[PDB]
């Protein structure tokens, strides 16, 4: 299993929107949950993104893909974005019991 994250590099203007797409690849079952992270340009700390406000997530099990949309881009949205997909190696047949894979990241530059 691995996650394909697109786009890997992008520049946007303020007030524009970004959609990042992650698709879980080479796995026999669906993903069990997703998480999005941000490290703002200039900083070293990875923050977990809460979905709500200007952040919108759409999970499409079927294509096994999950997408993050950020509205009304601000200059301070600049940074690296990462997606994580949780999954069971055994498709949960073995009790509990998980692993995760993450996308390559998206380097966003606003304005």
């Amino acid at each position: 299993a691995w996650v394909d994250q697109t786009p890997r590099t992008i520049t946007k203007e303020t007030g524009e929107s970004l959609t990042i797409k992650c698709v879980l690849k080479d796995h026999s079952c669906g993903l069990s949950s997703t998480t999005w992270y941000r490290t703002q340009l200039g900083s070293t700390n990875e923050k977990t993104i809460s979905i709500g406000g200007r952040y919108d997530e759409t999970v499409d099990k079927g294509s096994k893909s999950f997408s993050l949309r950020i509205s009304d881009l601000r200059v301070e949205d600049s940074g690296t974005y990462k997606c994580q997909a949780d999954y069971s190696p055994s498709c949960y047949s073995y009790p509990s019991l998980e692993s995760a894979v993450e996308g390559a990241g998206t380097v966003l530059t606003v304005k």
Side-chain angles (χ1 to χ4, degrees), residues 16-76:
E16 289 192 292
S17 292
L18 210 213
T19 308
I20 302 164
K21 189 220 264 159
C22 291
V23 16
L24 175 75
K25 294 266 192 84
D26 293 301
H27 185 60
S28 298
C29 33
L31 61 289
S32 323
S33 47
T34 68
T35 312
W36 293 86
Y37 311 85
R38 184 169 110 257
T39 299
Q40 175 171 358
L41 210 211
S43 295
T44 60
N45 55 135
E46 195 174 74
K47 303 173 308 303
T48 301
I49 293 164
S50 298
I51 308 306
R54 296 189 295 121
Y55 307 100
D56 161 46
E57 186 179 24
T58 305
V59 175
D60 176 0
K61 48 184 182 58
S63 34
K64 310 217 262 207
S65 69
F66 52 119
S67 286
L68 181 75
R69 188 177 197 95
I70 310 148
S71 310
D72 201 8
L73 287 160
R74 284 95 221 267
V75 125
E76 65 270 8

